[PDB]
Swiss-Prot record, chain A:
It is found in: Nucleus; Nucleus, Nucleolus; Cell membrane. Binds phospholipids via its C-terminal CRAL-TRIO domain. Binds primarily glycerophospholipids with monounsaturated C18:1 and/or C16:1 fatty acid moieties and a phosphatidylethanolamine or phosphatidylcholine headgroup. Has lesser affinity for lipids containing phosphatidylserine and phosphatidylinositol. This is Neurofibromin. It is linked to Neurofibromatosis 1: A disease characterized by patches of skin pigmentation (cafe-au-lait spots), Lisch nodules of the iris, tumors in the peripheral nervous system and fibromatous skin tumors. Individuals with the disorder have increased susceptibility to the development of benign and malignant tumors. Signal peptide: none annotated. The chain holds residues 1918 to 2201 of 2839 of the full protein. Stimulates the GTPase activity of Ras. NF1 shows greater affinity for Ras GAP, but lower specific activity. May be a regulator of Ras activity.
From Swiss-Prot, chain B:
It comes from Homo sapiens (Human). Coiled coil: none annotated. Residues 18-275 are annotated as: Lipid binding. This is Neurofibromin. Ubiquitinated by RNF7/RBX2, leading to its degradation. Changing residue 43 to V: In NF1; reduces protein stability. Changing residue 133 to A: Reduces phospholipid binding.
Amino acid sequence: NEPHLTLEFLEECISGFSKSSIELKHLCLEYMTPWLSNLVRFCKHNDDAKRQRVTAILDKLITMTINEKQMYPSIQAKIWGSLGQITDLLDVVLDSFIKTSATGGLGSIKAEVMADTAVALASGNVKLVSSKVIGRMCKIIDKTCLSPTPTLEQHLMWDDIAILARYMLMLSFNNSLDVAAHLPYLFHVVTFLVATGPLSLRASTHGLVINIIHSLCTCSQLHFSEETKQVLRLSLTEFSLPKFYLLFGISKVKSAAVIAFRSSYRDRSFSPGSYERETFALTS
Amino acid sequence: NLTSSKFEEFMTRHQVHEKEEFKALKTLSIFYQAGTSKAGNPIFYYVARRFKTGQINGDLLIYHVLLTLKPYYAKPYEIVVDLTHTGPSNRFKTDFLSKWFVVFPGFAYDNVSAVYIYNCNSWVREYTKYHERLLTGLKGSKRLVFIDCPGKLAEHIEHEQQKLPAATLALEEDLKVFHNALKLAHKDTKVSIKVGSTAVQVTSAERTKVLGQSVFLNDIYYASEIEEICLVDENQFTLTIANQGTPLTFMHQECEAIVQSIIHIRTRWELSQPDSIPQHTKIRPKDVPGTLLNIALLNLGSSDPSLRSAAYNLLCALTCTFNLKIEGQLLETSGLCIPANNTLFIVSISKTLAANEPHLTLEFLEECISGFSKSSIELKHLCLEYMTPWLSNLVRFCKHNDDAKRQRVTAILDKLITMTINEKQM
């Protein structure tokens, strides 16, 4: 019953959060969460320049998550888990994640961590985060026509597509990307990414396909007969054969998952190397 | 390249006589000749109990049976097989069973005057169905005669000459008969229950088709093997037995009378045995379902991409093996890329399982607390997230008819208090 204090209250609470000790930081979390729900009115406050204020607040929140590694399991459940139930606020929140990842770069820690955070954000509204991450990817690819380049890796927007791929990879698991409505747009982008990019990025595309098929087999909205499900289950095994490793360009790799994920992604940024890249054949 | 002549030479060439195991078979009294029958054909008695599945060499038994039948198998002979208290322990393997059809010369099979089966049970009928192909020759066999009741075999066989196993005769089925007892199960069949002095025999009152011949199944359950005796209600009682999964339920007008006798028989056994308290120290996988679930959930939020997949597959097996009910769907797979931020998914599963699976609470929390100390600083926070929902389920256990389960929760509470003292930061 006091929304107007939200803006000034939250700004101070975040500033005091950093100075507090580990034990006192937990207290800040307990009473900070209720205020978060009041940003709905302020986020669209007649564009009175108060909207710019909330964006600053979100950037501050992102910085705390990056640093508070030990308290990561609780920040997602309380801050991001609850923050993901505000439909009107999802659009602005997602943009900040993309901008934050953009500044860091493709291999930066900042972009890697924001991908993890999006999993909690999409949990509240799968139907909206899934239908909003794909739409941006389709437009970045559609904007490469303005400045044609010999190859995608040499295009200016290459980093934007690469970072957006990591977000889709994380959202694929456990049917967090709505295949039942976005399947046509998933293959369209998979074809433009197969066997393109560094070995880390090439294994990512293979994992994405493996998870899209699994979601289909474990989807309740669709009612596939038992005959059809057998074909899908066989298809899942086929894509895991060494034959497809060469097709995707990940031959000589025992497991795609190991290459796709890196354990020390919070301490240090990714260090791409071995720029020598295999070729692709349109028959593949 | 095996035949009766070849097999005989190998055993004769082999020094089976001095192995000291062939002599033991004589002590075990397996397939021993006992007088004759009405027609005068020799009688043999094979005891299923005396034969272990693998503890003894299969060749030695065949030679012993062949050696005893060698002098007399030329003439017509009668063989009686004792299948009393038949169990999975005493059985013939698929490969081992086949040899009997070929090892013998073949003309002896025609000299099988008659076959008598006594105290048959359902397991044997179940075994026959699985091994029907091998036993197809015996399907609808005229030589197979089923002893529906003890009073019929004595007529067909020469009385005062039959030499059935002493242990079988010891029971004698000479105890109270609780006629008109109904075996409540997927199918209802009238069963006559006898509370024997040392065992309980359930004799079906409806004939059953075994190899195309009508017979009454007679399952026998030793009193010592009746670990649990629960009288749920006067309408029906529960009798759980070792490694039988769901217990056996029957309907009788006076269940307590049957249960009282079973308890009375069981209580006497406790005095007879020297030391019943020393036992257990062995856990079967079914016995500890909650313990496995804690390992899968604990490792699902790990930081190793190659360990999350292994935990997920283990979780998939657990639901199917134990028929766990979940909101979504799980499909076993290899090569799945599970993200590191596997936090919200784990918590949803625990809430659903906790909500509609209270009985796992006691075993779930006991394991979860023990793992809490071993877990890392970050992983300790995960243990908190999914542990809380189960705590609600203790409401029923606190007053569980003071069955000594109340003592368990007190240990759990003491464990929780210790965590608070040490986890100052949390």
